[PDB]
């Protein structure tokens with residue numbers, strides 16, 4: 001029933017690439033909410049990541065943090081996570097957001113066909129682009145913003161500018177607490 | 182000799198793509214300033230200049246250059262840079278272009294004389310090397326595929342533009358009813 005977007009990631013740190021995708025999909029598909037789902041890490045503390053995530057999202061009631069993947073140590077197969085969430089929120093239609101580059105590879109995901117019954121995949125395409133896939137997925141066109149957590153971590157380490165890449169508030173948190181040096 | 186960046190465009194509207202590039206090049210090459218150089222139903226010059234102002238008001242080292250606007254009709258880059266080098270003889274101009282454009286430099290009007298007037302700065306995606314016969318500087322910048330025309334289309338379709346251009350510029354747009 002209720003349409004909720006899911007966006008996974010390390011959020012280490014969270015950045016404007018996350019916010020942009022969350023906002024676009026939120027509007028394109030007319031979602032009720034978008035949940036940011038912090039993954040485990042393949043190191044910044046979990047608390048630090050959640051506080052940055054909180055600062056990143058504090059300004060929009062429709063963005064929320066989901067801790068499911070954290071109540072269990074080690075890597076989670078997306079299927080396990082989504083199984084738990086559908087179990088917990090039976091009246092929610094989950095929209096699992098993925099990059100268009102990822103769409104090609106979906107057949108390689110653990111338990112992909114059972115996973116397809118749990119969620120609606122949303123692929124992010126560059127404007128003007130059609131995604132090629134055997135599976136029935138939704139496409140949302142979004143200008144490419146090639147920023148990533150790891151790129152930002154490098155930069156902070158090299159004392160290089162990050163202006164415009166992640167929220168001013170998260171930057172302050174980072175500098176204040178001396179993350180990524 | 183002062184190092185000044187030049188970034189050309191319609192700025193119709195100006196957006197975070199512009200600011201991002203300007204900031205990256207400013208820091209990468211340790212420039213003194215970056216000048217935004219506006220090109221010549223169409224938005225008024227004054228509207229464009231005003232948005233450009235709002236977009237850049239917060240950084241003393243971003244400035245607006247009116248050279249191309251002071252000549253009615255379009256201006257080859259060579260003509261513009263010739264004028265600027267005349268007026269600012271002690272400036273080393275860093276003309277900023279997209280990596281995709283680097284391929285097509287040999288096709289520019291008077292490219293060879295132009296090379297003596299400016300240092301080209303090509304914007305590359307991280308990890309990629311630009312291929313060109315000419316001696317240019319490379320700055321790596323994460324791709325932000327936003328453009329004025331994309332934004333104009335978005336506004337006409339009453340579609341969200343959050344995170345794509347500065348709030349001050351959005352507000353300006355909604356208040357002067359631009360792009361509907």
Ligand SMILES: [K+]
Nearest residue numbers: 057060061063
């Ligand atoms: K919130």
Ligand SMILES: [K+]
Nearest residue numbers: 237238240243
């Ligand atoms: K300024």
